[PDB]
């Protein structure tokens, strides 16, 4: 490796480090992690270590605010990677969160020598629930859109947990216990996950008009042999995953219109009992869908308030 190549690689690494620090300074957790991930990868690709870059950062500073955020992130990620390692699933979610600790540590060690101590602003109070949401946003950003944590789409499960944390915030009910329950969850309680009391994979309730695909010409093949509450469950699970693709209000509107145009939606809206059909009642599953739509809308609004701040 020529000197000119090393110089060019270190100058690009410095720029990557600076991008991460810039995000950190703005309190943009997901942006910081995206930047930190790229710094780390690039350095590894160029066989450059923390000791190689550190001399180049002598004109740079991690602020006291920055160190406070790094400390909170470390603790939050450590806790989350432990909480997310469960009998249901212990590979994907902990692996993702553990990578956050590794890349963030690397960013810091590029600046700080092994024996020098971080200097956090002792009065800068970092919100653990904000940090956790930031980690989840990062996971959403890095995940393949078809990847799963246990039986659930990773991006949908992240939206689920982000929304759950946001609800705790709005209810001022954020503490270790309530956060632990969200972090350790894999959506095992399917009725909670889908906001549908009757969520099931088995025969579910007996009905006069058990749901089926038989009166519907354009339903996807995967549903054709499903019936009843199990059929509605599967449709709701797939609709949930589709909703989690929304990025802003306009994309949500579009996705919702597309879903409602489907025979799958008509199945949800068709009553399985005489009273629902006779009196023209909204079904439980339509209400579940609307609840997920509204939660997605509010979560979008909430995170877009946050983009303005970061
Ligand atoms: C108008 C206010 C009262 C009311 O909501 O009644 C609905 C209730 C339940 O309606 P239904 O029997 O139609 O059962 C509902 C139907 O199976 C819906 O399709 C279900 O939603 P889905 O799971 O989305 O299919 C509802 O869960 C059922 O309750 O009716 C009775 O209990 C009368 C019993 C003689
Ligand atoms: Na039946």
Swiss-Prot record:
It is found in: Secreted; Host cytoplasmic vesicle membrane. Changing residue 74 to D: Almost abolishes GEF and GDF activities, but still binds Rab1. Changing residue 95 to D: Abolishes GEF and GDF activities, but still binds Rab1. Residues 208-310 are annotated as: P4M region. Changing residue 99 to D/E: Abolishes GEF and GDF activities, but still binds Rab1. Residues 4-184 are annotated as: Rab1 guanine nucleotide exchange factor. Changing residue 144 to A: Slightly impairs GEF and GDF activities. It comes from the Bacteria. Virulence effector that plays a key role in hijacking the host vesicular trafficking by recruiting the small guanosine triphosphatase (GTPase) Rab1 to the cytosolic face of the Legionella-containing vacuole (LCVs). Acts as a GDP-GTP exchange factor (GEF) for the small GTPase Rab1 (RAB1A, RAB1B or RAB1C), thereby converting Rab1 to an active GTP-bound state, leading to the incorporation of Rab1 into LCVs. Also shows RabGDI displacement factor (GDF) activity; however, this probably represents a passive activity following the GEF activity. The P4M (PtdIns(4)P-binding) region mediates binding to PtdIns(4)P and membrane attachment. Interacts with host RAB1A. Belongs to the DrrA family. This is Multifunctional virulence effector protein DrrA. It comes from Legionella pneumophila subsp. pneumophila (strain Philadelphia 1 / ATCC 33152 / DSM 7513). The chain holds residues 337 to 646 of 647 of the full protein.
